[PDB]
């Protein structure tokens, strides 16, 4: 029996999105996508993690949202690749944040990612 | 900010399902559905809850699954009549369990539902 803790609504996680000006990268075992067309916005990163004994375990899905609620980036596992580590997640988030910040966006991370950043 | 804690995968929560023999009922601002055709199966109730300060807040979605993974029951909030109580939820779960058990199914609930049953 697994469990999942997420910042996102079901609709936020299921919603289709695509990039005006796609930028993709792959760091670790994680696909990183973001829209290069997004500039001068406030963005929040929200995540869905699996959880074991109240401890965050594995990143399932991360999406970047503007204030209008639009999706502008995503970090997700590739099915055809093995599992990722904590440092793979932190590296991937750092790539997404740096990409967004290069277009003068202000990015903050959700409470759940804030706990994942340091948790033993 | 509200987060969500769930026993279900994204696919499990978004999958379309239908009753061979539809049975539908409303109690306490909650819509209860179950397939009257299902008998002699092993069923687990899984749920999605909002969470505030590590405390389970409100039921978002409950679905009943056979060992094989078929959805055979659901409890969901009414679209625009929010505000169901803890007692409303427990009563709706009891109605669903009693209905499934009267068709000779064995029913158990997820650890998240079990926590919600008692939490102050």
């Amino acid at each position: 029996a697994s469990r999942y803790l997420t910042d996102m609504t079901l609709e936020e996680m299921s919603r289709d999105w695509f990039m005006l000006m796609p930028k993709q990268k792959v760091a670790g075992s994680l696909c990183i996508r973001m829209d290069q067309a997004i500039m001068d916005k406030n963005i929040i990163l929200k995540a869905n993690f699996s959880v074991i004994f109240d401890r965050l375990e594995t990143l399932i899905l991360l999406r970047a949202f503007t204030e209008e609620g639009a999706i502008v980036g995503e970090i997700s596992p590739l099915p055809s690749l093995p599992g990722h580590t904590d440092e793979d997640v932190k590296n991937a988030v750092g790539v997404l944040i740096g990409g967004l910040e290069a277009n003068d966006n202000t990015v903050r991370v959700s409470e759940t990612l804030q706990r994942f950043a340091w948790r033993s």
Side-chain angles (χ1 to χ4, degrees), chain A residues 40-94:
Chain A
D40 308 310
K41 296 289 181 55
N42 293 321
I43 296 177
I44 177 159
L45 308 191
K46 304 194 185 173
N48 178 35
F49 283 90
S50 67
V51 289
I52 313 285
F53 306 133
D54 209 80
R55 179 177 182 278
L56 297 171
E57 185 70 21
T58 298
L59 178 68
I60 303 307
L61 173 69
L62 176 154
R63 282 183 165 188
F65 299 86
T66 63
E67 291 188 39
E68 288 93 15
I71 300 164
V72 304
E74 182 173 54
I75 297 171
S76 46
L78 289 190
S80 307
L81 293 181
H84 42 280
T85 62
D86 290 344
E87 267 300 331
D88 298 315
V89 174
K90 285 178 209 178
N91 186 29
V93 167

